[PDB]
Write a protein that binds this ligand. Structure first.
Ligand SMILES: [Ca+2]
Length: 357
């Protein structure tokens, strides 16, 4: 396969992000449950891409703080990857990073604190943290979902990585599981692809699946939320879990996540390649930032609208499956919406165009 890597700009070009728009006037919130970011590596990275470095600021929730541990392989990787990908692509936007303790309550408070923030007023929030929906406490899931509902009502977009361990989401109970908060019908669930592209076009884009050891995109059918009414025409299948219950299909969209075709970033002074679905949420959040800029108002809750747009708005991923546990190939990609890549990778200009009144 020969391992390769792209810079965030390269991917954005492949997905045809709208030119002449950089997030000017927008604020992107990013939730972090641990680690931190150092300004030295951010300045270097933004300088290296020739974009004017966006203002980045940390917010403390329940006493949590921006505390990079210095380990390029730890949580800093998540924090700096999120910041670099979103800022590199929406340099005109202001980035607000919310640090909360790694608990259900901290996660929730971080979310509600950002959504209702009068000082930073974000219109978009990026989430690259989560867990299988079946393991969360019901009360947590209920409160989280409500907060996501409130975000929808207020016109704030919320994106979340669908997970990096295929259809089983890293559990060893023999069942399939989708990840939360991705599972929430109020968040735009971000899946992962293996993208082979040059600036002029996409030579190939398939489901991200490197097996148990390399990871694979989360995706499947929720066991908690029923199929949303606006997703009833997407042909979501019934869960593969004996019982075959119907439910909200994950994800909604997908973008390059395979680390073998990863993103070049600088983590704690270290230049490297990182991937996974957590790179996808910031990727599209900057996409959203550009649309919001062009349009007069925040696009907010996008799901219902996305599922009703014409085929031209998306590059259909039809090859691959996200099964890393067995040979059943559960949740395979196919024509149209699928439990691996949902509607596929968006085409920036066409998405913008479709939403330009
Ligand atoms: Ca498809």
């Amino acid at each position: 396969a020969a391992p390769t890597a792209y810079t965030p700009l390269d991917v954005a070009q492949a997905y045809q992000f709208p030119e002449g728009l950089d997030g000017q006037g927008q604020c992107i919130a990013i939730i972090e449950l641990g680690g931190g970011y150092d300004e030295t590596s951010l300045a270097q990275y933004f300088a290296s891409l020739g974009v004017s470095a966006p203002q980045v600021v940390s917010v403390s929730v329940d006493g949590a703080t921006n505390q990079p541990t210095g380990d390029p392989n730890g949580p800093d990787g998540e924090v700096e990857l999120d910041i670099e990908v979103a800022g590199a692509l929406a340099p005109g936007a202001k980035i607000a990073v919310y640090f909360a303790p790694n608990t259900d309550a901290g996660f929730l408070n971080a979310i509600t604190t950002a959504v209702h923030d009068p000082t930073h007023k974000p219109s978009i929030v990026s989430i690259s943290w989560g867990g299988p929906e079946d393991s969360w406490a019901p009360a947590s899931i209920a409160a989280m979902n409500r907060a996501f509902l409130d975000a929808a009502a207020l016109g704030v977009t919320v994106l979340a990585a669908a997970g990096d361990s295929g259809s089983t989401d890293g559990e060893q109970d023999g069942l399939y599981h989708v990840d939360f908060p991705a599972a929430s019908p109020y968040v735009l669930a971000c899946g992962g692809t293996r993208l082979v592209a040059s600036a002029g076009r996409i030579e190939r884009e398939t489901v991200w699946n490197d097996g148990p050891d390399g990871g694979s995109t989360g995706g499947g059918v929720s066991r908690i939320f029923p199929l949303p009414s606006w997703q009833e025409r997407a042909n979501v299948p019934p869960s593969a879990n004996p019982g075959a219950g119907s439910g909200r299909g994950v994800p909604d969209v997908a973008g390059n996540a395979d680390p073998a075709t990863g993103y070049e970033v600088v983590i704690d002074g270290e230049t490297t390649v990182i991937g996974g679905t957590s790179a996808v949420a910031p990727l599209f959040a900057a996409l959203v930032a550009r649309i919001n800029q062009k349009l007069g108002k925040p696009v907010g809750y996008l799901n219902p609208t996305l599922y009703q747009l014409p085929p031209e708005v998306f590059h259909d991923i039809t090859e691959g499956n996200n099964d890393i546990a067995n040979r059943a190939r559960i949740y395979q990609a196919g024509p149209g919406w699928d439990p691996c890549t949902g509607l596929g990778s968006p085409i920036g200009i066409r998405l913008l165009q479709a939403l330009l009144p």
